[PDB]
PDB file of all heavy atoms in Angstrom:
ATOM      1  N   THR Y 322      -8.102   8.268  12.473  1.00 51.34           N
ATOM      2  CA  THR Y 322      -9.085   7.249  12.876  1.00 51.34           C
ATOM      3  C   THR Y 322     -10.411   7.359  12.124  1.00 51.34           C
ATOM      4  O   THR Y 322     -10.930   6.348  11.640  1.00 51.34           O
ATOM      5  CB  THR Y 322      -9.355   7.249  14.398  1.00 51.34           C
ATOM      6  OG1 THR Y 322      -9.657   8.579  14.838  1.00 51.34           O
ATOM      7  CG2 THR Y 322      -8.151   6.714  15.161  1.00 51.34           C
ATOM      8  N   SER Y 323     -10.951   8.577  12.039  1.00 50.94           N
ATOM      9  CA  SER Y 323     -12.205   8.840  11.324  1.00 50.94           C
ATOM     10  C   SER Y 323     -12.036   8.671   9.814  1.00 50.94           C
ATOM     11  O   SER Y 323     -12.915   8.119   9.149  1.00 50.94           O
ATOM     12  CB  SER Y 323     -12.745  10.236  11.652  1.00 50.94           C
ATOM     13  OG  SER Y 323     -11.917  11.255  11.116  1.00 50.94           O
ATOM     14  N   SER Y 324     -10.899   9.141   9.298  1.00 53.79           N
ATOM     15  CA  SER Y 324     -10.518   8.992   7.889  1.00 53.79           C
ATOM     16  C   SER Y 324     -10.361   7.525   7.479  1.00 53.79           C
ATOM     17  O   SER Y 324     -10.708   7.149   6.356  1.00 53.79           O
ATOM     18  CB  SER Y 324      -9.228   9.767   7.605  1.00 53.79           C
ATOM     19  OG  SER Y 324      -8.176   9.337   8.450  1.00 53.79           O
ATOM     20  N   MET Y 325      -9.842   6.711   8.400  1.00 52.34           N
ATOM     21  CA  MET Y 325      -9.737   5.259   8.229  1.00 52.34           C
ATOM     22  C   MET Y 325     -11.120   4.592   8.149  1.00 52.34           C
ATOM     23  O   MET Y 325     -11.313   3.648   7.375  1.00 52.34           O
ATOM     24  CB  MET Y 325      -8.872   4.660   9.354  1.00 52.34           C
ATOM     25  CG  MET Y 325      -8.795   3.139   9.426  1.00 52.34           C
ATOM     26  SD  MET Y 325      -8.299   2.294   7.911  1.00 52.34           S
ATOM     27  CE  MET Y 325      -9.271   0.799   8.054  1.00 52.34           C
ATOM     28  N   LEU Y 326     -12.069   5.100   8.939  1.00 52.62           N
ATOM     29  CA  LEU Y 326     -13.462   4.629   8.917  1.00 52.62           C
ATOM     30  C   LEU Y 326     -14.180   4.955   7.604  1.00 52.62           C
ATOM     31  O   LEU Y 326     -15.045   4.190   7.166  1.00 52.62           O
ATOM     32  CB  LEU Y 326     -14.252   5.197  10.101  1.00 52.62           C
ATOM     33  CG  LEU Y 326     -13.949   4.704  11.520  1.00 52.62           C
ATOM     34  CD1 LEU Y 326     -14.307   5.785  12.528  1.00 52.62           C
ATOM     35  CD2 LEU Y 326     -14.675   3.403  11.839  1.00 52.62           C
ATOM     36  N   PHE Y 327     -13.821   6.086   6.991  1.00 51.05           N
ATOM     37  CA  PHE Y 327     -14.341   6.472   5.672  1.00 51.05           C
ATOM     38  C   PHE Y 327     -13.801   5.592   4.542  1.00 51.05           C
ATOM     39  O   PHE Y 327     -14.472   5.415   3.520  1.00 51.05           O
ATOM     40  CB  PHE Y 327     -14.064   7.954   5.373  1.00 51.05           C
ATOM     41  CG  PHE Y 327     -14.921   8.916   6.160  1.00 51.05           C
ATOM     42  CD1 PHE Y 327     -14.332   9.885   6.973  1.00 51.05           C
ATOM     43  CD2 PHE Y 327     -16.318   8.879   6.069  1.00 51.05           C
ATOM     44  CE1 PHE Y 327     -15.114  10.782   7.698  1.00 51.05           C
ATOM     45  CE2 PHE Y 327     -17.104   9.773   6.789  1.00 51.05           C
ATOM     46  CZ  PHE Y 327     -16.500  10.727   7.603  1.00 51.05           C
ATOM     47  N   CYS Y 328     -12.596   5.052   4.733  1.00 57.95           N
ATOM     48  CA  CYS Y 328     -11.995   4.087   3.803  1.00 57.95           C
ATOM     49  C   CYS Y 328     -12.700   2.729   3.842  1.00 57.95           C
ATOM     50  O   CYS Y 328     -12.758   2.030   2.826  1.00 57.95           O
ATOM     51  CB  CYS Y 328     -10.500   3.920   4.084  1.00 57.95           C
ATOM     52  SG  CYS Y 328      -9.503   5.374   3.686  1.00 57.95           S
ATOM     53  N   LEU Y 329     -13.218   2.364   5.016  1.00 58.92           N
ATOM     54  CA  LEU Y 329     -14.053   1.169   5.186  1.00 58.92           C
ATOM     55  C   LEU Y 329     -15.430   1.353   4.549  1.00 58.92           C
ATOM     56  O   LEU Y 329     -16.003   0.400   4.013  1.00 58.92           O
ATOM     57  CB  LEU Y 329     -14.214   0.815   6.669  1.00 58.92           C
ATOM     58  CG  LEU Y 329     -13.017   0.309   7.481  1.00 58.92           C
ATOM     59  CD1 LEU Y 329     -13.302   0.491   8.961  1.00 58.92           C
ATOM     60  CD2 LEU Y 329     -12.676  -1.144   7.178  1.00 58.92           C
ATOM     61  N   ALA Y 330     -15.951   2.580   4.624  1.00 60.13           N
ATOM     62  CA  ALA Y 330     -17.206   2.958   3.973  1.00 60.13           C
ATOM     63  C   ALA Y 330     -17.063   3.009   2.451  1.00 60.13           C
ATOM     64  O   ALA Y 330     -18.027   2.756   1.725  1.00 60.13           O
ATOM     65  CB  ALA Y 330     -17.701   4.294   4.509  1.00 60.13           C
ATOM     66  N   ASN Y 331     -15.855   3.341   1.988  1.00 58.77           N
ATOM     67  CA  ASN Y 331     -15.510   3.363   0.564  1.00 58.77           C
ATOM     68  C   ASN Y 331     -15.467   1.957  -0.037  1.00 58.77           C
ATOM     69  O   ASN Y 331     -15.929   1.749  -1.163  1.00 58.77           O
ATOM     70  CB  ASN Y 331     -14.162   4.065   0.353  1.00 58.77           C
ATOM     71  CG  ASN Y 331     -13.851   4.322  -1.115  1.00 58.77           C
ATOM     72  OD1 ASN Y 331     -14.664   4.905  -1.848  1.00 58.77           O
ATOM     73  ND2 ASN Y 331     -12.659   3.896  -1.545  1.00 58.77           N
ATOM     74  N   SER Y 332     -14.912   1.008   0.722  1.00 59.47           N
ATOM     75  CA  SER Y 332     -14.781  -0.390   0.299  1.00 59.47           C
ATOM     76  C   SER Y 332     -16.124  -1.118   0.196  1.00 59.47           C
ATOM     77  O   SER Y 332     -16.271  -2.042  -0.609  1.00 59.47           O
ATOM     78  CB  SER Y 332     -13.835  -1.150   1.234  1.00 59.47           C
ATOM     79  OG  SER Y 332     -14.305  -1.130   2.571  1.00 59.47           O
ATOM     80  N   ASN Y 333     -17.090  -0.699   1.014  1.00 62.08           N
ATOM     81  CA  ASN Y 333     -18.452  -1.237   0.976  1.00 62.08           C
ATOM     82  C   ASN Y 333     -19.301  -0.606  -0.128  1.00 62.08           C
ATOM     83  O   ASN Y 333     -20.135  -1.286  -0.732  1.00 62.08           O
ATOM     84  CB  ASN Y 333     -19.138  -1.076   2.338  1.00 62.08           C
ATOM     85  CG  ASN Y 333     -18.628  -2.060   3.383  1.00 62.08           C
ATOM     86  OD1 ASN Y 333     -17.601  -2.726   3.197  1.00 62.08           O
ATOM     87  ND2 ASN Y 333     -19.352  -2.152   4.499  1.00 62.08           N
ATOM     88  N   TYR Y 334     -19.083   0.685  -0.386  1.00 58.66           N
ATOM     89  CA  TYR Y 334     -19.836   1.426  -1.404  1.00 58.66           C
ATOM     90  C   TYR Y 334     -19.429   1.078  -2.839  1.00 58.66           C
ATOM     91  O   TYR Y 334     -20.258   1.151  -3.748  1.00 58.66           O
ATOM     92  CB  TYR Y 334     -19.744   2.941  -1.164  1.00 58.66           C
ATOM     93  CG  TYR Y 334     -20.647   3.770  -2.059  1.00 58.66           C
ATOM     94  CD1 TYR Y 334     -22.015   3.901  -1.782  1.00 58.66           C
ATOM     95  CD2 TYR Y 334     -20.136   4.420  -3.189  1.00 58.66           C
ATOM     96  CE1 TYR Y 334     -22.845   4.654  -2.605  1.00 58.66           C
ATOM     97  CE2 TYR Y 334     -20.956   5.175  -4.019  1.00 58.66           C
ATOM     98  CZ  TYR Y 334     -22.307   5.289  -3.723  1.00 58.66           C
ATOM     99  OH  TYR Y 334     -23.120   6.036  -4.543  1.00 58.66           O
ATOM    100  N   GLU Y 335     -18.166   0.699  -3.039  1.00 54.43           N
ATOM    101  CA  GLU Y 335     -17.658   0.336  -4.374  1.00 54.43           C
ATOM    102  C   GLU Y 335     -18.171  -1.018  -4.897  1.00 54.43           C
ATOM    103  O   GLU Y 335     -18.004  -1.335  -6.081  1.00 54.43           O
ATOM    104  CB  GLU Y 335     -16.120   0.410  -4.425  1.00 54.43           C
ATOM    105  CG  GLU Y 335     -15.378  -0.597  -3.550  1.00 54.43           C
ATOM    106  CD  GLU Y 335     -13.870  -0.564  -3.745  1.00 54.43           C
ATOM    107  OE1 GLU Y 335     -13.267   0.528  -3.638  1.00 54.43           O
ATOM    108  OE2 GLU Y 335     -13.284  -1.638  -3.994  1.00 54.43           O
ATOM    109  N   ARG Y 336     -18.801  -1.795  -4.014  1.00 53.91           N
ATOM    110  CA  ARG Y 336     -19.306  -3.135  -4.338  1.00 53.91           C
ATOM    111  C   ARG Y 336     -20.833  -3.178  -4.449  1.00 53.91           C
ATOM    112  O   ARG Y 336     -21.375  -3.795  -5.371  1.00 53.91           O
ATOM    113  CB  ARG Y 336     -18.824  -4.158  -3.299  1.00 53.91           C
ATOM    114  CG  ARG Y 336     -17.313  -4.226  -3.131  1.00 53.91           C
ATOM    115  CD  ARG Y 336     -16.922  -5.085  -1.939  1.00 53.91           C
ATOM    116  NE  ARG Y 336     -15.552  -4.818  -1.500  1.00 53.91           N
ATOM    117  CZ  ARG Y 336     -14.461  -5.417  -1.976  1.00 53.91           C
ATOM    118  NH1 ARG Y 336     -14.544  -6.343  -2.926  1.00 53.91           N
ATOM    119  NH2 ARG Y 336     -13.271  -5.084  -1.494  1.00 53.91           N
ATOM    120  N   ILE Y 337     -21.511  -2.516  -3.510  1.00 53.67           N
ATOM    121  CA  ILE Y 337     -22.977  -2.526  -3.407  1.00 53.67           C
ATOM    122  C   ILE Y 337     -23.609  -1.337  -4.155  1.00 53.67           C
ATOM    123  O   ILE Y 337     -24.680  -1.480  -4.759  1.00 53.67           O
ATOM    124  CB  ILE Y 337     -23.434  -2.622  -1.918  1.00 53.67           C
ATOM    125  CG1 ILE Y 337     -23.172  -4.026  -1.352  1.00 53.67           C
ATOM    126  CG2 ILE Y 337     -24.916  -2.323  -1.735  1.00 53.67           C
ATOM    127  CD1 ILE Y 337     -21.894  -4.167  -0.549  1.00 53.67           C
ATOM    128  N   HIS Y 338     -22.924  -0.189  -4.122  1.00 53.58           N
ATOM    129  CA  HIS Y 338     -23.358   1.086  -4.748  1.00 53.58           C
ATOM    130  C   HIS Y 338     -24.577   1.746  -4.081  1.00 53.58           C
ATOM    131  O   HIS Y 338     -25.288   2.550  -4.700  1.00 53.58           O
ATOM    132  CB  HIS Y 338     -23.518   0.958  -6.277  1.00 53.58           C
ATOM    133  CG  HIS Y 338     -22.251   0.597  -6.987  1.00 53.58           C
ATOM    134  ND1 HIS Y 338     -21.353   1.544  -7.433  1.00 53.58           N
ATOM    135  CD2 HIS Y 338     -21.729  -0.605  -7.325  1.00 53.58           C
ATOM    136  CE1 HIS Y 338     -20.334   0.939  -8.016  1.00 53.58           C
ATOM    137  NE2 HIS Y 338     -20.538  -0.365  -7.964  1.00 53.58           N
ATOM    138  N   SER Y 339     -24.787   1.400  -2.810  1.00 55.20           N
ATOM    139  CA  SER Y 339     -25.730   2.074  -1.914  1.00 55.20           C
ATOM    140  C   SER Y 339     -25.246   1.887  -0.477  1.00 55.20           C
ATOM    141  O   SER Y 339     -24.987   0.758  -0.044  1.00 55.20           O
ATOM    142  CB  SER Y 339     -27.158   1.542  -2.090  1.00 55.20           C
ATOM    143  OG  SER Y 339     -27.226   0.146  -1.858  1.00 55.20           O
ATOM    144  N   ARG Y 340     -25.128   2.997   0.253  1.00 56.33           N
ATOM    145  CA  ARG Y 340     -24.519   3.004   1.596  1.00 56.33           C
ATOM    146  C   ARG Y 340     -25.456   2.590   2.748  1.00 56.33           C
ATOM    147  O   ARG Y 340     -25.218   2.945   3.911  1.00 56.33           O
ATOM    148  CB  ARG Y 340     -23.831   4.353   1.877  1.00 56.33           C
ATOM    149  CG  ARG Y 340     -24.749   5.570   1.892  1.00 56.33           C
ATOM    150  CD  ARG Y 340     -24.008   6.817   2.350  1.00 56.33           C
ATOM    151  NE  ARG Y 340     -23.043   7.283   1.353  1.00 56.33           N
ATOM    152  CZ  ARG Y 340     -23.314   8.137   0.368  1.00 56.33           C
ATOM    153  NH1 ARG Y 340     -24.533   8.646   0.226  1.00 56.33           N
ATOM    154  NH2 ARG Y 340     -22.355   8.488  -0.477  1.00 56.33           N
ATOM    155  N   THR Y 341     -26.502   1.829   2.421  1.00 58.00           N
ATOM    156  CA  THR Y 341     -27.452   1.320   3.412  1.00 58.00           C
ATOM    157  C   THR Y 341     -26.787   0.239   4.271  1.00 58.00           C
ATOM    158  O   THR Y 341     -26.258  -0.750   3.748  1.00 58.00           O
ATOM    159  CB  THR Y 341     -28.746   0.783   2.754  1.00 58.00           C
ATOM    160  OG1 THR Y 341     -29.158   1.663   1.701  1.00 58.00           O
ATOM    161  CG2 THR Y 341     -29.873   0.671   3.780  1.00 58.00           C
ATOM    162  N   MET Y 342     -26.812   0.460   5.585  1.00 57.03           N
ATOM    163  CA  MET Y 342     -26.200  -0.429   6.577  1.00 57.03           C
ATOM    164  C   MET Y 342     -26.928  -1.775   6.684  1.00 57.03           C
ATOM    165  O   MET Y 342     -26.289  -2.817   6.865  1.00 57.03           O
ATOM    166  CB  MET Y 342     -26.146   0.278   7.939  1.00 57.03           C
ATOM    167  CG  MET Y 342     -25.510  -0.509   9.079  1.00 57.03           C
ATOM    168  SD  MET Y 342     -25.833   0.202  10.707  1.00 57.03           S
ATOM    169  CE  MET Y 342     -27.616   0.045  10.838  1.00 57.03           C
ATOM    170  N   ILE Y 343     -28.256  -1.735   6.567  1.00 56.10           N
ATOM    171  CA  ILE Y 343     -29.115  -2.925   6.667  1.00 56.10           C
ATOM    172  C   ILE Y 343     -28.905  -3.872   5.476  1.00 56.10           C
ATOM    173  O   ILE Y 343     -28.906  -5.096   5.647  1.00 56.10           O
ATOM    174  CB  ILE Y 343     -30.617  -2.552   6.812  1.00 56.10           C
ATOM    175  CG1 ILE Y 343     -30.799  -1.341   7.740  1.00 56.10           C
ATOM    176  CG2 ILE Y 343     -31.425  -3.736   7.338  1.00 56.10           C
ATOM    177  CD1 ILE Y 343     -31.983  -0.458   7.400  1.00 56.10           C
ATOM    178  N   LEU Y 344     -28.712  -3.297   4.286  1.00 56.15           N
ATOM    179  CA  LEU Y 344     -28.485  -4.065   3.056  1.00 56.15           C
ATOM    180  C   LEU Y 344     -27.105  -4.735   3.040  1.00 56.15           C
ATOM    181  O   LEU Y 344     -27.010  -5.952   2.850  1.00 56.15           O
ATOM    182  CB  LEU Y 344     -28.685  -3.179   1.815  1.00 56.15           C
ATOM    183  CG  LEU Y 344     -28.814  -3.825   0.427  1.00 56.15           C
ATOM    184  CD1 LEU Y 344     -30.166  -4.497   0.222  1.00 56.15           C
ATOM    185  CD2 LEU Y 344     -28.578  -2.783  -0.655  1.00 56.15           C
ATOM    186  N   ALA Y 345     -26.052  -3.940   3.240  1.00 50.84           N
ATOM    187  CA  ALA Y 345     -24.681  -4.446   3.309  1.00 50.84           C
ATOM    188  C   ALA Y 345     -24.418  -5.074   4.682  1.00 50.84           C
ATOM    189  O   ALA Y 345     -24.026  -4.389   5.636  1.00 50.84           O
ATOM    190  CB  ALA Y 345     -23.680  -3.341   2.996  1.00 50.84           C
ATOM    191  N   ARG Y 346     -24.652  -6.383   4.762  1.00 51.52           N
ATOM    192  CA  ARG Y 346     -24.577  -7.130   6.015  1.00 51.52           C
ATOM    193  C   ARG Y 346     -23.859  -8.466   5.805  1.00 51.52           C
ATOM    194  O   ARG Y 346     -24.342  -9.333   5.065  1.00 51.52           O
ATOM    195  CB  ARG Y 346     -25.990  -7.340   6.581  1.00 51.52           C
ATOM    196  CG  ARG Y 346     -26.053  -7.856   8.013  1.00 51.52           C
ATOM    197  CD  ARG Y 346     -27.480  -7.881   8.547  1.00 51.52           C
ATOM    198  NE  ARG Y 346     -28.282  -8.975   7.987  1.00 51.52           N
ATOM    199  CZ  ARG Y 346     -29.214  -8.843   7.042  1.00 51.52           C
ATOM    200  NH1 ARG Y 346     -29.495  -7.655   6.517  1.00 51.52           N
ATOM    201  NH2 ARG Y 346     -29.872  -9.912   6.617  1.00 51.52           N
ATOM    202  N   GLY Y 347     -22.700  -8.612   6.446  1.00 51.86           N
ATOM    203  CA  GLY Y 347     -21.928  -9.853   6.400  1.00 51.86           C
ATOM    204  C   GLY Y 347     -20.453  -9.687   6.076  1.00 51.86           C
ATOM    205  O   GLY Y 347     -20.089  -9.369   4.938  1.00 51.86           O
ATOM    206  N   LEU Y 348     -19.614  -9.899   7.091  1.00 56.24           N
ATOM    207  CA  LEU Y 348     -18.161  -9.994   6.933  1.00 56.24           C
ATOM    208  C   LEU Y 348     -17.718 -11.448   7.101  1.00 56.24           C
ATOM    209  O   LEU Y 348     -18.540 -12.317   7.418  1.00 56.24           O
ATOM    210  CB  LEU Y 348     -17.438  -9.103   7.957  1.00 56.24           C
ATOM    211  CG  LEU Y 348     -17.466  -7.571   7.873  1.00 56.24           C
ATOM    212  CD1 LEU Y 348     -16.903  -6.985   9.158  1.00 56.24           C
ATOM    213  CD2 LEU Y 348     -16.699  -7.036   6.670  1.00 56.24           C
ATOM    214  N   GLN Y 349     -16.425 -11.702   6.866  1.00 52.56           N
ATOM    215  CA  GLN Y 349     -15.766 -13.017   7.063  1.00 52.56           C
ATOM    216  C   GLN Y 349     -16.184 -14.116   6.075  1.00 52.56           C
ATOM    217  O   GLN Y 349     -15.357 -14.947   5.688  1.00 52.56           O
ATOM    218  CB  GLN Y 349     -15.878 -13.499   8.520  1.00 52.56           C
ATOM    219  CG  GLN Y 349     -15.073 -12.663   9.508  1.00 52.56           C
ATOM    220  CD  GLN Y 349     -15.838 -12.301  10.773  1.00 52.56           C
ATOM    221  OE1 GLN Y 349     -17.022 -12.614  10.923  1.00 52.56           O
ATOM    222  NE2 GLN Y 349     -15.158 -11.621  11.690  1.00 52.56           N
ATOM    223  N   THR Y 350     -17.459 -14.115   5.686  1.00 52.73           N
ATOM    224  CA  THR Y 350     -17.989 -15.007   4.648  1.00 52.73           C
ATOM    225  C   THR Y 350     -17.465 -14.621   3.263  1.00 52.73           C
ATOM    226  O   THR Y 350     -17.256 -15.487   2.407  1.00 52.73           O
ATOM    227  CB  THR Y 350     -19.535 -15.012   4.621  1.00 52.73           C
ATOM    228  OG1 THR Y 350     -20.023 -13.667   4.541  1.00 52.73           O
ATOM    229  CG2 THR Y 350     -20.104 -15.685   5.870  1.00 52.73           C
ATOM    230  N   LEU Y 351     -17.258 -13.318   3.059  1.00 52.34           N
ATOM    231  CA  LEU Y 351     -16.705 -12.775   1.815  1.00 52.34           C
ATOM    232  C   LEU Y 351     -15.411 -11.991   2.050  1.00 52.34           C
ATOM    233  O   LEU Y 351     -14.490 -12.051   1.229  1.00 52.34           O
ATOM    234  CB  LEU Y 351     -17.738 -11.892   1.101  1.00 52.34           C
ATOM    235  CG  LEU Y 351     -18.990 -12.539   0.490  1.00 52.34           C
ATOM    236  CD1 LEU Y 351     -20.125 -11.529   0.412  1.00 52.34           C
ATOM    237  CD2 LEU Y 351     -18.713 -13.145  -0.881  1.00 52.34           C
ATOM    238  N   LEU Y 352     -15.353 -11.263   3.169  1.00 52.11           N
ATOM    239  CA  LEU Y 352     -14.200 -10.427   3.519  1.00 52.11           C
ATOM    240  C   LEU Y 352     -13.594 -10.861   4.867  1.00 52.11           C
ATOM    241  O   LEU Y 352     -13.975 -10.330   5.918  1.00 52.11           O
ATOM    242  CB  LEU Y 352     -14.586  -8.936   3.538  1.00 52.11           C
ATOM    243  CG  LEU Y 352     -15.451  -8.314   2.430  1.00 52.11           C
ATOM    244  CD1 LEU Y 352     -16.047  -6.992   2.888  1.00 52.11           C
ATOM    245  CD2 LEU Y 352     -14.696  -8.136   1.122  1.00 52.11           C
ATOM    246  N   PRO Y 353     -12.652 -11.836   4.843  1.00 52.42           N
ATOM    247  CA  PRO Y 353     -12.056 -12.352   6.084  1.00 52.42           C
ATOM    248  C   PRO Y 353     -10.975 -11.446   6.682  1.00 52.42           C
ATOM    249  O   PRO Y 353     -10.977 -11.213   7.895  1.00 52.42           O
ATOM    250  CB  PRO Y 353     -11.453 -13.705   5.661  1.00 52.42           C
ATOM    251  CG  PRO Y 353     -11.849 -13.917   4.235  1.00 52.42           C
ATOM    252  CD  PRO Y 353     -12.144 -12.566   3.669  1.00 52.42           C
ATOM    253  N   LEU Y 354     -10.069 -10.950   5.837  1.00 52.38           N
ATOM    254  CA  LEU Y 354      -8.938 -10.123   6.269  1.00 52.38           C
ATOM    255  C   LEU Y 354      -9.351  -8.693   6.633  1.00 52.38           C
ATOM    256  O   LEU Y 354      -8.757  -8.089   7.530  1.00 52.38           O
ATOM    257  CB  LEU Y 354      -7.832 -10.134   5.202  1.00 52.38           C
ATOM    258  CG  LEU Y 354      -6.483  -9.463   5.490  1.00 52.38           C
ATOM    259  CD1 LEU Y 354      -5.325 -10.399   5.182  1.00 52.38           C
ATOM    260  CD2 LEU Y 354      -6.350  -8.159   4.717  1.00 52.38           C
ATOM    261  N   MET Y 355     -10.365  -8.170   5.942  1.00 51.12           N
ATOM    262  CA  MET Y 355     -10.886  -6.818   6.184  1.00 51.12           C
ATOM    263  C   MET Y 355     -11.566  -6.679   7.551  1.00 51.12           C
ATOM    264  O   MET Y 355     -11.583  -5.586   8.127  1.00 51.12           O
ATOM    265  CB  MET Y 355     -11.842  -6.402   5.061  1.00 51.12           C
ATOM    266  CG  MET Y 355     -11.975  -4.895   4.870  1.00 51.12           C
ATOM    267  SD  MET Y 355     -13.065  -4.419   3.514  1.00 51.12           S
ATOM    268  CE  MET Y 355     -11.995  -4.663   2.095  1.00 51.12           C
ATOM    269  N   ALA Y 356     -12.107  -7.789   8.060  1.00 51.55           N
ATOM    270  CA  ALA Y 356     -12.784  -7.847   9.364  1.00 51.55           C
ATOM    271  C   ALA Y 356     -11.879  -7.503  10.553  1.00 51.55           C
ATOM    272  O   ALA Y 356     -12.345  -6.925  11.539  1.00 51.55           O
ATOM    273  CB  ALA Y 356     -13.429  -9.210   9.565  1.00 51.55           C
ATOM    274  N   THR Y 357     -10.598  -7.869  10.456  1.00 53.53           N
ATOM    275  CA  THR Y 357      -9.591  -7.508  11.464  1.00 53.53           C
ATOM    276  C   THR Y 357      -9.236  -6.020  11.391  1.00 53.53           C
ATOM    277  O   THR Y 357      -8.963  -5.393  12.419  1.00 53.53           O
ATOM    278  CB  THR Y 357      -8.302  -8.353  11.348  1.00 53.53           C
ATOM    279  OG1 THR Y 357      -7.797  -8.291  10.009  1.00 53.53           O
ATOM    280  CG2 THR Y 357      -8.560  -9.810  11.731  1.00 53.53           C
ATOM    281  N   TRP Y 358      -9.243  -5.471  10.174  1.00 52.46           N
ATOM    282  CA  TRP Y 358      -9.029  -4.039   9.945  1.00 52.46           C
ATOM    283  C   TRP Y 358     -10.239  -3.200  10.357  1.00 52.46           C
ATOM    284  O   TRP Y 358     -10.087  -2.027  10.711  1.00 52.46           O
ATOM    285  CB  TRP Y 358      -8.667  -3.763   8.484  1.00 52.46           C
ATOM    286  CG  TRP Y 358      -7.348  -4.347   8.048  1.00 52.46           C
ATOM    287  CD1 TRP Y 358      -7.161  -5.348   7.140  1.00 52.46           C
ATOM    288  CD2 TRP Y 358      -6.038  -3.961   8.494  1.00 52.46           C
ATOM    289  NE1 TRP Y 358      -5.822  -5.616   6.992  1.00 52.46           N
ATOM    290  CE2 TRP Y 358      -5.107  -4.782   7.810  1.00 52.46           C
ATOM    291  CE3 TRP Y 358      -5.557  -3.008   9.406  1.00 52.46           C
ATOM    292  CZ2 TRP Y 358      -3.720  -4.678   8.008  1.00 52.46           C
ATOM    293  CZ3 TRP Y 358      -4.174  -2.902   9.605  1.00 52.46           C
ATOM    294  CH2 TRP Y 358      -3.274  -3.736   8.905  1.00 52.46           C
ATOM    295  N   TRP Y 359     -11.429  -3.803  10.293  1.00 54.94           N
ATOM    296  CA  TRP Y 359     -12.663  -3.209  10.822  1.00 54.94           C
ATOM    297  C   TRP Y 359     -12.585  -3.011  12.336  1.00 54.94           C
ATOM    298  O   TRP Y 359     -13.084  -2.012  12.857  1.00 54.94           O
ATOM    299  CB  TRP Y 359     -13.879  -4.073  10.476  1.00 54.94           C
ATOM    300  CG  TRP Y 359     -14.589  -3.669   9.215  1.00 54.94           C
ATOM    301  CD1 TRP Y 359     -14.449  -4.230   7.979  1.00 54.94           C
ATOM    302  CD2 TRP Y 359     -15.562  -2.623   9.073  1.00 54.94           C
ATOM    303  NE1 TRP Y 359     -15.267  -3.598   7.073  1.00 54.94           N
ATOM    304  CE2 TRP Y 359     -15.963  -2.608   7.716  1.00 54.94           C
ATOM    305  CE3 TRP Y 359     -16.134  -1.695   9.961  1.00 54.94           C
ATOM    306  CZ2 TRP Y 359     -16.911  -1.698   7.218  1.00 54.94           C
ATOM    307  CZ3 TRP Y 359     -17.078  -0.787   9.467  1.00 54.94           C
ATOM    308  CH2 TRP Y 359     -17.456  -0.798   8.106  1.00 54.94           C
ATOM    309  N   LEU Y 360     -11.955  -3.967  13.024  1.00 55.46           N
ATOM    310  CA  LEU Y 360     -11.763  -3.926  14.476  1.00 55.46           C
ATOM    311  C   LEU Y 360     -10.740  -2.871  14.901  1.00 55.46           C
ATOM    312  O   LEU Y 360     -10.990  -2.107  15.833  1.00 55.46           O
ATOM    313  CB  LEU Y 360     -11.351  -5.305  15.007  1.00 55.46           C
ATOM    314  CG  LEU Y 360     -12.377  -6.442  14.972  1.00 55.46           C
ATOM    315  CD1 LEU Y 360     -11.672  -7.780  14.808  1.00 55.46           C
ATOM    316  CD2 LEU Y 360     -13.267  -6.437  16.208  1.00 55.46           C
TER     317      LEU Y 360
END
């Protein structure tokens, strides 16, 4: 479960290149299918 959460953190870091939560904001508008996996 925790390892799966790190894979979600990996998918966000490979695009933005900074792990700031406030900066990386917005699912479904760009990532529709990943949002269900986030849940």
